[PDB]
RNA sequence: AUGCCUGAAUAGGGUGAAGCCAGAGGAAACUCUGGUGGAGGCUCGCGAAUUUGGGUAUAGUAGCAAAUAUUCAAAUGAGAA
């Protein structure tokens, strides 16, 4: 009963920490990735 | 040997390059997983070679000429494999 309860608190919480730290790697891929970008016009 | 002009052809099987998308590691750079995409002095059936049309320059013996399988009935005809 209450080990599903553990388990998708659990479950979630990986996901949270997962999509934050996925978060993180695609706002710093992308921004250098705009600059490199707007850069490379000139 | 090197050309030039105008046409035909430059096929197929396999493998799967950049680039892209989505995931996981690390502060980046960068490295892996899946997909996508469809490229090449990639493969498969000093020297040689490098498809093609037209035009245009520098003893009655040997033997039967070889490309397999012919058969029956009728017609024509002097005479029919």
């Given amino acids: 009963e209450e080990e599903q309860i553990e388990k998708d608190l659990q479950g979630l919480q ?3 920490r997962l999509n934050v730290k ?3 790697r ?3 891929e992308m921004k ?3 600059l490199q970008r707007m850069q490379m016009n000139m």
């Fill in 14 to 16: 990986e996901k949270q």
């Fill in 22 to 24: 996925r978060e993180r």
């Fill in 26 to 28: 695609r706002k710093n």
């Fill in 32 to 34: 250098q990735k705009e």
